[PDB]
Amino acid sequence: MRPPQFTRAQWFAIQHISLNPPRCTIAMRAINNYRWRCKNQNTFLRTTFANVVNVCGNQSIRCPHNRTLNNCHRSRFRVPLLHCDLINPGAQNISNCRYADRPGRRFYVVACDNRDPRDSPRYPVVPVHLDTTI
């Protein structure tokens, strides 16, 4: 699971929000620094946290990758993004993780929930997981 020092929303932001990410092999270091092993896949949405919070206010829909859940929200517009795929999944630690870059422009679907006590009071409802992009 996530690093306990972060709320779900804070960990969401670290993984999935980056306006101008460098190459994936570089960009992923910031995430994998907090892990014991390299993440196999990751999408960076080139947007802002505030913007994703606004999408949380869209109509509630079924989560495509969690079909028993209906607290998901789809962006009204396609957003630029950078998807990263781990090239060497046999990596035993995070010192050497190499990623392939996949830029794109897609709608995103996020699950949102009530904030954690450690989350900022500015946003009572926050994104907690990136479900998929379309």
Add this chain to the structure above:
Amino acid sequence: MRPPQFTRAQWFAIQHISLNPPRCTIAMRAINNYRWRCKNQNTFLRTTFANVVNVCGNQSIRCPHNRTLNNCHRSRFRVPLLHCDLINPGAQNISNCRYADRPGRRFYVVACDNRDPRDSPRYPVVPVHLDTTI
């Protein structure tokens, strides 16, 4: 990291050794039962633990997915295998993980090390990680 109740070799066997695995969505349940989240990819080698231990005795080579390591060992023969890929990586828990099946027949490369005290004394050197298949 791995479930602490298992040695590296025991966890290797649970993940990577299955002579007659069912469909991936079924076969992966046995692994994901011990995790909080679904594994993104997994290869089942259709062999036996004893056979992989024997490969550990082959010439020491560089680990293709861990290029600072040279405690890897390549099988002399191709072995039947089942590779599993997570179709819904947005899954938030293990209740609903769906996998695509990829059967094949490939050489395998394992990293091997000295056994853990909790490992059986029958095998002083054991596989501890599946590095890659070729």
Add this chain to the structure above:
Amino acid sequence: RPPQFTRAQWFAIQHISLNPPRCTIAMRAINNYRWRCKNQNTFLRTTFANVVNVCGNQSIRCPHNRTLNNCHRSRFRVPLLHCDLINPGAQNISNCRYADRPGRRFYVVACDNRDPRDSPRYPVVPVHLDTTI
């Protein structure tokens, strides 16, 4: 808690043992699921059925979780074995050493609706040992 277990299953593993051996032996089965030695653990010498019956007692605020009100205190003192970690500086679970502190105390358990994976025959089950008195 190892994810393959429900909270009730993990409660029973840690806290229900009718006739535990010496602590240094008894604790091995718990610590095998851990990276580091558990600092303290109480084995209640009781049965799961006895504890489920306590879940039917008057609900009280949880002494160690004061925002929760689904705790239940045993009407009587029950035999137990408390284990205290002698070497908390231990860096792994290779040689966890425990002091044995047998006793008889009231216990307070939190009880909740069963997990879908739990037996369907007990609708309400103990899920954590809050404290002993």
Add this chain to the structure above:
Amino acid sequence: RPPQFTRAQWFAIQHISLNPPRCTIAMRAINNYRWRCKNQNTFLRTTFANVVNVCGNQSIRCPHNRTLNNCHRSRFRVPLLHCDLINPGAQNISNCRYADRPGRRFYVVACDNRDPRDSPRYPVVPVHLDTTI
């Protein structure tokens, strides 16, 4: 230990604090890296340089890790704040409550070669607090 830290960095976070506040406050910075309240923690009121100097003392067997011989005992007693968890039945870190036990004791630290991520200016660093006397 959070993987972003070296053992020495994590040692300093947990165990080096020159003027710690009351335990219930001081422990918050440690427990934020954890899922559950730490049961006990000693803050040595010292500096990292002081502890590195102790690493130069006579190596001894580690009292709580008896297969290890890279421990070092402080020549003198040092001021400290020991914190004991009052509510170990706490199910999360929302309200960890600690009893304050100020004191002055010898300490025993394990010391090792620095991590590649550690400062290159201290070749040998404290990596774990084995015990206090």
